[PDB]
Amino acid sequence: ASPFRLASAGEISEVQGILRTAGLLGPEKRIAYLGVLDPARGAGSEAEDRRFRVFIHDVSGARPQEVTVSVTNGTVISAVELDTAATGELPVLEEEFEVVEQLLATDERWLKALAARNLDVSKVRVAPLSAGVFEYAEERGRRILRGLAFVQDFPEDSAWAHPVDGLVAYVDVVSKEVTRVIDTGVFPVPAEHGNYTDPELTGPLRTTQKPISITQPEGPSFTVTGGNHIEWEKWSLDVGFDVREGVVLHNIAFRDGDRLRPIINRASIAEMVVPYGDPSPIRSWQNYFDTGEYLVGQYANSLELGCDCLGDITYLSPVISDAFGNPREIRNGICMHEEDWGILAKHSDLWSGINYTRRNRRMVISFFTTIGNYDYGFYWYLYLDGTIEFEAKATGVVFTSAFPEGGSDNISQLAPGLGAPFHQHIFSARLDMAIDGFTNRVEEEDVVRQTMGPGNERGNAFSRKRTVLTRESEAVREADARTGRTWIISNPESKNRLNEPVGYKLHAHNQPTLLADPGSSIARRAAFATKDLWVTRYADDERYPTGDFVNQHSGGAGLPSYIAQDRDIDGQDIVVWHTFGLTHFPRVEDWPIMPVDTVGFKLRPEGFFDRSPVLDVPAN
Amino acid sequence: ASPFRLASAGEISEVQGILRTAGLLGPEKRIAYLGVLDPARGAGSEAEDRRFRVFIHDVSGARPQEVTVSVTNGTVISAVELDTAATGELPVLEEEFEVVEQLLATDERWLKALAARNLDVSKVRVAPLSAGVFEYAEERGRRILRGLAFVQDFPEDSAWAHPVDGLVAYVDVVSKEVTRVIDTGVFPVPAEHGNYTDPELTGPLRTTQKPISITQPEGPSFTVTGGNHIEWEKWSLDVGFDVREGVVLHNIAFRDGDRLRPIINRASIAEMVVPYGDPSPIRSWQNYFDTGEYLVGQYANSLELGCDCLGDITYLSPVISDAFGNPREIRNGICMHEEDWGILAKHSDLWSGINYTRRNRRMVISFFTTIGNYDYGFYWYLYLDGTIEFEAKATGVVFTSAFPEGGSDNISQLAPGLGAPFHQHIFSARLDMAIDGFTNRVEEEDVVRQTMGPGNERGNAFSRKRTVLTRESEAVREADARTGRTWIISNPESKNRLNEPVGYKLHAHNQPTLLADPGSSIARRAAFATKDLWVTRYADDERYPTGDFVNQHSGGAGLPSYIAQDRDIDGQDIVVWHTFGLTHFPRVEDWPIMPVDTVGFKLRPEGFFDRSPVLDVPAN
Ligand SMILES: [Br-]
Ligand SMILES: [Br-]
Ligand SMILES: [Br-]
Ligand SMILES: [Br-]
Ligand SMILES: [Br-]
Ligand SMILES: [Br-]
Ligand SMILES: [Br-]
Ligand SMILES: [Br-]
Ligand SMILES: [Cu+2]
Ligand SMILES: [Cu+2]
Ligand SMILES: [K+]
Ligand SMILES: [K+]
Ligand code: NA
Ligand code: NA
DSSP: OTTTTTHHHHHHHHHHHHHHHHOOOOEEEEEEEEEEEEOOOGGGGGGOOOEEEEEEEEEEEOOEEEEEETTTTEEEEEEOOOOOHOOOOOOOOOTTHHHHHHEEEHHHHHHHHHTTOOOOOOGGEEEEEEEOOSGGGGGTTTEEEEHHHHHOSSSTTTTGGGGTTEEEEEEEEHHHEEEEEEEEEOOOOOOOOTTTHHHHOOSSSSOOOOOEEOOOOOSOOOETTTTTTTETTEEEEEEEEETEEEEEEEEEEEEEEEEEEEEEEEEEEEEEEEEOOOOOOTTTTOEEEEIIOOOOOGBOOOOOOOOTTTOOOOOEEEEEOOOOOOOOEEETEEEEEEEEEEEEEEEETTOOOOOEEEEEEEEEEEEEEETTTEEEEEEEEEEESSSSSEEEEEEEEEOOOOTTOOOOOSSEEEETTEEEEEEEEEEEEEEEEEEEOBEHHHEHHHHHHHHBTTBBTTTTOEEEEEEEEBBBGGGGEEGGGGGGOEEEEEEEEETTTSOEEEEEEEEEEOOOOOOOTTTHHHHHEEEEEEEEEEEOOOOOTOTTTTOOOOOOOOOOSHHHHHHHOOOOTTTEEEEEEEEEEEEEEEEOSSSSSSSEEEEEEEEEESSSSSOTTTTTTTOO | OOOOSSSOOOHHHHHHHHHHTTTTOOTTTEEEEEEOOOOOTTTTGSSOOOEEEEEEEEETTTOOEEEEEEETTTEEEEEEOHHHHHHHHOOOOOOGGGGGHHTTOOHHHHHHHHTTOOOGGGEEEEEEEEEOOOOGGTTTTTTTTEEEEEOSSSSTTOOOEEEEEEEEEEEEETTTTTEEEEEEEOOOOOSSSSOOTTHHHHOOOOOOOOOOEOTTTTTOOOEEEEEEEETTTTTEEEEEEETTTTEEEEEEEETTTTEEEEEEEEEEEEEEEEBBOOOSSTTTTTTEEEEIIIOOGBOOOOOOOOOTTTTSOOEHHHHHOOOTTTTEOOOOOOEEEEEEEEEEEEEOOTTTTOEEEEEEEEEEEEEEEEEEEEEEEEEEEETTTTOOOEEEEEEEOOOOOOOOTTSSSSSSEEEEEEEEEOEEEEEEEEEEEOOOEEEEBEEEEEEOOSSSSSTBBOOOOOOEEEEEEBGGOOOEEEEOOGGOOOOEEEEEEEEOSSSSSEEEEEEEOOOOOSSOOOOOHHHHHTGGGGGGGEEEEEEEEEOTTSSSOOTOOOSSSSSHHHTTTTTTTTTBBBBEEEEEEEEEOOGGGSSSSSEEEEEEEEEESSSSSSOOOTOOOOOO
16 A cells, blocks of 8 residues: 555565575675665655665675665666775674674684683673774775673673773674784773672662553554554654664654645654764774664564553564565564643633643654663654654663773773763754645744844843755754754745744754764764754755765765755755764763663744644543 | 641631731731741751741831741741832732722723723723833832733633733832823734634544543552651652742652662742843833742642643642731642653663663652743652652743734734734742752863864863852853753762762753843843852842842842852852743744743752662562
8 A cells, every 4th residue: 555654574575586586695695784765756646666775795705785676576676786995884784793702702812812811701792893994904895893892700691890991803704804903901800790680789679669550441542554654633644664764754744624734754863873982992993873883773672561661552563684685573663652741731811710721642653772782762752732752762781991090081980990981872863854845944043132222222122033044055053052043944835824934943952962073083974963953955865964884984975975065955855964962971870770861852833833733622 | 747847727827816916917918928937957956936927018008017927936026117119029919910900990091092992991901010120210119010901802701812002001009090101002902812712713622532541559659748748769858838939849858778868958949030022112121020029839720630630649738828817728739649751771681681671750749820821830850760850831821912014023923913022931940959968069060072182093082071169159150052061069078989979960951041131120130040050058048049029129139149248159058049941932833822831950860879779670
């Protein structure tokens, strides 16, 4: 039915079959990425052509390929060999996670380093860490992972409590070579365990928490049709899933009277990166593009009813490819439910004598992923009043190091001798806008203070100004919390009943952006993260602010290359890219497992409707 | 026998009898404010002395008085005549709300103004609006209210839909003189009604919302003892209520193993002001101290189960005084309940194989108040992980005006010819700190970026710095969202296991502060609102950031006056005052009754605990 339906197991198997038939998926080939492509613009009338894009890795050292296939027609649309030294390496494969530790286990330099620290190699876990691009010339064109070690005392021990500092190794995962082992000196391995299920650490469990029961006796207020089409309280959308981006929202629209009014064509988190701010050579290379390098979707957790998701839950179970092109279901990977959200509107009037109260609700679409030590929840909310919100919840175990004897300006202490390097978690939300359709524009709105004097004799006046961003060259914007800066996406050709263009206002949290020196590799590779807001003209091949291949890829792709085209964005099909993140100076309270912290953004209607859109909500 | 217990009806009627017998409450007297005084420092080595503070107004022209009585002993401790021209007028009385309209009804100037506009005087409501201090010398020492007119077409009509622009009057409520009527010219009275319960406006009500049932089979997890002492999930506190401030939290502490550890001695919203930014002389004087001038506590709503408060709710019903000293119960004026709050902590580990998830919850203490057109909900939240949060929810009906032909830089259009003047809602949270006791200090913490170079060769390093605020003269701080600025309250004499002072970190929303010109009357009378963070040395009589008598006070009272003392605040008994506000450019969606919008702040432990304080939370 719908061209926006989730990929099915059959489609994935068919992609495998088509690739095999075309001689593109022999036994040395691995699928590093596979996803369905959105329908082209103006396809609405066209019949379905379900197309999939695939990145294909070769374990024998041959060049990888990027391939697009039509599962509908059984054909390869295009297949190109990639020059990874130029355009980037493919995403990290799950089947490579164990390879770093396995290669190091027999390397004489690594063993000597462990011996110097009296560590048993059999107990030393090594993290499969993305490499970035630095001064090591031999890495260019090679598929490299770096390794940092953590001691696991026994099979269920949290290795994060026992970082092995002063030691790092680099590995070529295709040639199976350890290229470098760097030992800057021995640090004590912190000894305290961090086992949050150990009663000796938890103490006796609380018996004080009484149950909270959340039920819906008549079922949920939303409907699900065509597998992933949601209708709830005037909202309409399709819930997609991509192995790289995770949950993606399509065709967000609101039924206002008789018209289904588009708001956002596609919403996703198109990248997220964790740059570390410790200048030690052991970690100064660390920048984890959890989305672009590791693919957050593939590690989506199966969500347990009553634990991960509470209330009347409707699940989706998206299907992804394994490394060989076989379909694999992520059982209960997506939770959907509505929840009460307090008071919506309330007034008791001194003159009419009328008292009025209405309650609010939001629809929630979420998933939770795990990347190494991190676990992140991605939440999209739709509210009765037209507000759209995203929230990321960050938890997991903090990435650790030794804590230096004399203290540190770049690392906090979590436990005796145990450090946690400062870092950020920085997201990019890609919002392909469609305010009442595709003809859109963005205005930056600042509060305007006014000077006391003629026309303002009491010095109380204040105002605001809006600046239309007309060309991509002028659409790279920074926050200004002090002046209440927001950005309005409007449709200059669709007006409300008061004759103003309909719009939505983006409210950022105004958290710090990328802190790294602008001359750093990470400032170039995560350039998007240096500014709060970018606006581009829509293009088929402009999907991620970091480009298609982030792994071991220098600057040269992504948002800075897109905006160079300086295209008209004033009343055109545009895409907003919003950078937002957490700057994390870890606290003692974050150890041994961290309480959730959050960051996000929201958009509120701004003269989109002709009056409040929730006057028709009943009291009950 | 808690000294922090809510005032009882008996205590209030005892105050009444004491005053009356002392000849302080004759027929011309009105109680403008009455509240119980908190215990003084170190009076725990002493038996009961419940004392009440009362502001007494005289309707016949005599000077008002400030009186303190001991209900424990049935005596007047002090009674002082006030010089209102010097120290300010008393808060507005509810019984004065109809007085402006009544005085104008027989004034020839007012009647001429209405006649010209063909408005039936019997249908014209006049708002009882605080006057401020401007250029009118005759007003010094007089109790003045100003009035703006709104047409009510029938008893149940929303008058806000029909503002009468170009007209304003000033009245002396004691002498009953209309001092001035100002007519700057005729504006059309907007004609559309704003009756949000009229099916003509709401249309057919939604039938799509299915019920959400929230129950607690075994009851709530918190206990209430001594009327208002709450214990919940390691938290301990007393819930107070004052007619001016509303809900007040006392003695917030956390049970950490063997010890009850104090965190905040008293938390309240000590002021909130609504300054208007329309330079028209009809409104340019408008600044409503909802707390200081009107007293938000006295207008607290009775909260309906299943409507205002959902779930297993425990109510407090605070008692206040009426204008004559009679006790009045606000039935179900305070809601207390716990609610689920999503995921608390989660990690699935690639090396241990352990999958771990825990749920979060928060304790909620709230009330909802109405001041003219506004309705605000005040919410305090305590979370399992030690976080403390406040949230204000703003709703009601927007204060209206005409929308000028030609448009406006200071007014929004909500409906045909109907305008909404720009304004802010700015709150001050007074946090009498007690981090592990009263010896506290505050540090301002900024992110510190680092330059690429020696010691930072890859240009990835970043850090932070902390600056101790040592004296009040250097303790008036502004936000800096760009450098992630926060403020830490710590106890330099109480260290965690890692030998660092325990602390709590204040995270502000960094919204704009007061926008008015610094030379305006409002910048002087609401100086608190011009800066985000102030720290003072604790003092008994320093209660509000705007002083005791805000109404028509000339300026400089409160924080500017306290700060001028330049007291030591480095390891002393200190008070944090955080300014935070909404800057409101009303949108069409705000009309005819506004969807809730929110603002607030939170404090998170910062090395207060020796590790996560929620390891003992069970799986559930
Ligand atoms: Br092959
Ligand atoms: Br070992
Ligand atoms: Br959820
Ligand atoms: Br982390
Ligand atoms: Br680079
Ligand atoms: Br009298
Ligand atoms: Br509540
Ligand atoms: Br308002
Ligand atoms: Cu972090
Ligand atoms: Cu407002
Ligand atoms: K086919
Ligand atoms: K007594
Ligand atoms: Na678009
Ligand atoms: Na204090």
